[PDB]
Amino acid sequence: PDSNIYKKPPIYKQRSKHLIEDLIIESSKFPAAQPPDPNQPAKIETDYWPCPPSLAVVETEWRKRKASRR
Amino acid sequence: AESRCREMDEQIRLMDQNLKCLSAAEEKYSQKEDKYEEEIKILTDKLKEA
Amino acid sequence: SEGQVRQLEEQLRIMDQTLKALMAAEDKYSQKEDKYEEEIKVLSDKLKEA
Amino acid sequence: DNDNSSARLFERSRIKALADEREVVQKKTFTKWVNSHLARVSCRITDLYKDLRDGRMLIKLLEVLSGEMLPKPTKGKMRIHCLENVDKALQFLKEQRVHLENMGSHDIVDGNHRLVLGLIWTIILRFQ
Amino acid sequence: NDNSSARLFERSRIKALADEREVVQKKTFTKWVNSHLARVSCRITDLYKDLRDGRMLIKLLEVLSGEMLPKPTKGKMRIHCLENVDKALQFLKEQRVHLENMGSHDIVDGNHRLVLGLIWTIILRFQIQ
């Protein structure tokens, strides 16, 4: 009854080879096959995400557009 | 907003008509009380005569 | 539409504030009348006894 | 219908008016109390009902008050990520054995006034 | 209408993501193949074009496995290239490695995804010496 879901580690986390081949194996895990750009926002932050956002963000965007229109 | 406006208009018209009815009764109450005091006067001088 | 909504809201508030005074006057008129009723019946009983 | 109209007049005027005055005063006072503690970091809220929807500022306020590190918010701008971010703060409150009743993530996200005010009041009663 | 927007979404997003991952993996795969091919006097510049005749694949398997492969056929025709690719693929079948949707004409015709998949399977499952 009193526990936090997010503080626990994920369930799937619980369970010689050439070094360069290990490097190419763990380089392929990233979606872009390379380490991500540090100061770049993720795909969810970007506004070209096709799915519509929450309503409060739409009201904020409307108010920004209205202040731009003057 | 327009759908709200129409039901507000209905409300104000109905309640205005209610106010008119209450004012109409409030007019009659005063002459009613005066006619009631006249009975006091008649009854007390009848009592003295008796 | 928004402007019309809020001005009619103000009208509704003013008019209910108007109606409350008629309510109070009605109540106090009736509370004045009932003791006149109780007075005349007692004094008429005294007159009949005399 | 006349006495029915009078009863509707009474419960439209007085019950609404007293509750609205009390909740407006409580909203201003709670806004000042939250702004005092949230000014240690560079954060400020203008409206209590609107800025608390996304759940980030609730996490910042709980981090300032409690003093340890809550899990970082879910990286998103959708309704589901919003619900997740509010649920994180609610679960962290469930750690501290603070008793919350009729409180859910969707109630904060939708912006129910009474439940948001009650959440702020419960936080004030705990962390003062 | 809806179909035009769906086509635009497909052509932008799917192709952009696929090409980006494909060129990154091709670059790093080419560097790895050159690193293992530097023992002999061999070097490839483009992964798709240089693997068509099948000599580089045979020499790469010769270097990696450390055991002798059959002699490549003599010729410059398309069918000789099919022979040279088939020898290397059949040797990979001999080393118990499971290749899927693999044929000689795919390597000879230079299909990008299948070439990258073959190189990735060689990187993953093939044991070296």
Structure description:
- The structure is cut from a larger assembly and holds 1 copy of chain A (70 residues), 1 copy of chain B (50 residues), 1 copy of chain C (50 residues) and 2 copies of chain D.
- Chain A has 70 residues and is mostly helical.
- Chain A starts with 18 loop residues before the first helix and ends with a helix.
- Chain A has 2 helices and no strands.
- Chain A is flat and about 65 Å long.
- Chain B has 50 residues and is mainly alpha-helical.
- Chain C is mainly α.
- Chain C contains 1 helix and no strands.
- Chain C is rod-shaped, with a radius of gyration of 22 Å.
- With 128 residues, chain D is mainly alpha-helical.
- The chains are: A mainly alpha (70), B mainly alpha (50), C mainly alpha (50), D mainly alpha (128).
- Chains in contact: A-D, A-E, B-C, C-D.
- Chains C and D meet through helix 1 of C and helix 1 of D.
- Chain D: Belongs to the spectrin family.
- Chain D: It is found in: Cytoplasm, Cell cortex; Cytoplasm, Cytoskeleton.
In short:
This is part of a larger assembly, with 1 copy of chain A (70 residues), 1 copy of chain B (50 residues), 1 copy of chain C (50 residues) and 2 copies of chain D. Chain B is built from 1 helix and no strands.
How much β-strand is present in the residues of chain D? under 5%
End-to-end Cα distance of chain A, whole Å, is 53 Å
Number of strands of chain A: 0
Query: What is the subunit arrangement here?
Result: part of a larger assembly
Q: Assign an overall shape of chain A.
A: flat
Which sequence of SSEs, written as H and E, runs from N to C of chain A? HH
Most extensive interface:
B-C, 28 and 27 residues
| SS summary, helix count of chain A | 2
If you compute it from the alpha carbons, what radius of gyration of chain D comes out, rounded to the nearest whole angstrom? 17 Å
Record field, number of beta strands of chain D: 0
Q: Please report the distance between the alpha carbons of the first and last residues of chain D.
A: 51 Å
Q: Specify Rg of chain A, calculated over alpha carbons.
A: 21 Å
Percentage of residues in strands of chain A: under 5%
Taken from the alpha-carbon principal axes, the silhouette of chain D is elongated
Structural class per helix/strand content of chain A? mainly alpha
Helix content of chain D: 55-70%
Features of the shown structure:
part of a larger assembly, 5 chains, B: 50 residues, mainly alpha, rod-shaped, C: 50 residues, 0% strand, membrane protein, membrane skeleton, spectrin-actin junction
What's the helix and strand layout?
The structure is cut from a larger assembly and holds 1 copy of chain A (about 70 residues), 1 copy of chain B (about 50 residues), 1 copy of chain C (about 50 residues) and 2 copies of chain D.
Chain A: H1 19-27, H2 55-69
Chain B: H1 2-49
Chain C: H1 2-49
PDB class: membrane protein
Keywords: membrane skeleton, spectrin-actin junction
Entry title: Structure of mammalian spectrin-actin junctional complex of membrane skeleton, State II, Global map
